[PDB]
Amino acid sequence: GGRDLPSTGFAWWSGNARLINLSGKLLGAHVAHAGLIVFWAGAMTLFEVAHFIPEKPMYEQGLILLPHIATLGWGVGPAGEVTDIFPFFVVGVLHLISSAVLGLGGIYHALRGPEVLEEYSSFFGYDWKDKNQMTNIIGYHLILLGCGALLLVFKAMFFGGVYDTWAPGGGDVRVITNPTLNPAIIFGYLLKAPFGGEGWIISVNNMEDIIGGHIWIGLICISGGIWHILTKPFGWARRALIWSGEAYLSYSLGALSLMGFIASVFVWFNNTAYPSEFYGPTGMEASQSQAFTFLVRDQRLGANIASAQGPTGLGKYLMRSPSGEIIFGGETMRFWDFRGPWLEPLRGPNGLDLDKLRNDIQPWQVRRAAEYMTHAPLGSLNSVGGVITDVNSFNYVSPRAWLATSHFVLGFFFLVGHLWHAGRARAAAAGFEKGIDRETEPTLFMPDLD
Amino acid sequence: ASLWEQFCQWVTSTNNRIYVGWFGTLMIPTLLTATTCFIIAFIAAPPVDIDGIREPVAGSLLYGNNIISGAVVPSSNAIGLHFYPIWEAASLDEWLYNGGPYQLVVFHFLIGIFCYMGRQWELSYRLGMRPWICVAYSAPVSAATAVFLIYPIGQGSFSDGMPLGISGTFNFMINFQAEHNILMHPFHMLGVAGVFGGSLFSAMHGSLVTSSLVRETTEVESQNYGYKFGQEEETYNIVAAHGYFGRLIFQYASFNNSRSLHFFLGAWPVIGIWFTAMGVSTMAFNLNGFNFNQSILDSQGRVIGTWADVLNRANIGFEVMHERNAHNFPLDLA
């Protein structure tokens, strides 16, 4: 394998392109990178644990990995309070140790092992143009991916459960016993409009639906893996697609960009898979919590929060949504589709219920609204929390902000990568990725436009 | 030879005066719909209740606006992120009052410009060109998506999208500075680097080529007539340009490779606009610019102001007056 520009045609800054047809060294690069990923998981988790203050809420400490563990129902109890730090520590250590095994394997394959696996094995040797084998690899991975989804299912059903923020009697780890197998609900979720009030799959709001989804996902992924191992690409797909390593990279880049945008939206809007007791309030929650907090204060001062018109003529604390639902007043009117386990007790069939808002408020609801309102996912780049005009004494940026901003940026740059590699794969398949041939420049044989 | 094949050949034809392509079969209807609705709205649309407090804003020329002040007003805050097509309104007048033209125009525009990017790739493919002009075009596409789609999504309302007008754009920027301190965001700083440098390099390259043109004309005619469209030979001496520029600064700060130079010219503003688009896109989730308010304290603990504190006073002034009737609670949470 050439490791210079004269032997490969690729400069040092495009050096990893020299691995396109070196399957052994490419496999080494891949396993060592996987090692990097697992290393970060373990090391960052151990950092978060060493920096963790167990009594202080998770979203106040710059944590993004321990919230993921706690949502899975490890190390936490009711309302997300930490019972034991050891499960987080164990998760970190196991990732950190496995990272070394993957690093070794990667450095081995990248440096010492065969540069090309074609000779060595028919099983591991692949040619980019060999559609049957590339679909075999798709299939083996689809079966492991579906197995991982079923691993989530098993943890939620048979191995202690997962954190259900919607649990009766307060949020807590719950064992899911009736996951939603009904394909109408599960796939209906896929068919919901990605706009306010519906939210496509972002609006999944119960662990039963999430778990039933992962049973379907595991089943569909395992079936698709078996299909791809026992089949070959059909004619229409053989004709509409580019069959090359860079092409497959560009396809995966498009998929990754889509998933990055989706993850950004998920963490920003959904509080079921991302519980607010770990991730802090969504911005919709913080706005509604502000409206609620001053609803309670003013009501306790004796105001009629129902019949109090604001300076504009709309109700100061309560109004109607454009479809008539009773909602919180003020600019929060935009977040009237927000659902939260501390709010939903005060909602009637018509929306917010006056009888409930006048008699059934609880101190935990007021405390929760105060906490969520003061932890609005608003903050500066140097982590000065609250609105940008505030002074420097509050060190807080929401984990939702960090995760959403990061994955939007990564999704966008991966869309750019998709375009880069998809256009390059197309041009290289067609044979003009290196520039225009002077003798057969196509425009010289095309008629003038005018 | 089939009729579908004939249609495919026409669509992908490189002999059409304007290339259509498959991406064009989407670009043309969407952009035409957006242009028609935009012109009609900008001229004649009735006032729009942007802030959802029943305080309609006049955006159209016939309602008292000039070209500078006119705009297509974003849809009502009461709508939030809800999808609001014409067939969800009980009358066109209700649709207009709530800012439906904004949703129609922006959605069709966004689709149209993504299709324009795809179309650029498509024609490059049909012409046997290299494929990355669309990558450069993805920078303005990203910025437009940031202001028309991502920022509204993060803030929770299409009412927070950039208005389709000049003074509406300034309002958007001012409000954005007041709530996000975009001037003190490093990604905006890279965007300013991108645009200042893009203009700097455009001027530099243009001036160096123009300075180094090969003598081809007489003093009575435009020097541009010394170039003939389609000529084999280069029209300026890059060696002379490099000698001048490498003496203006130092030899190693000057390009001798036109390919390397034209790459740099493309990459610098494109990267800078990608950063600024991502900056606007991340302040959509309220990850704002740097906060240095009361960062410097003396020994007793008294605040020594800096220029950032004066900037913060300007921001507070903007913030307390914006949407003067829309806030009922002390904190502007969105």
């Binding site: 003038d448 436009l449 005018d450 | 001229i43 020329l61 016939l62 000039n66 070209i67 006119g70 003939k228 469209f229 389609g230």
Partner: peptide, 30 residues
């Protein structure tokens, strides 16, 4: 009536665009 002025200048701009595209000087290889 300032509306008439604004529409007229905008229309002039758009019509110039149409003519510049539909009836441009045809680039020729010489």
């Amino acid at each position: 009536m300032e509306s008439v002025a604004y529409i007229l200048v905008l229309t002039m701009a758009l019509a110039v665009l149409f003519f510049a595209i539909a009836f441009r000087e045809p680039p020729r290889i010489e």
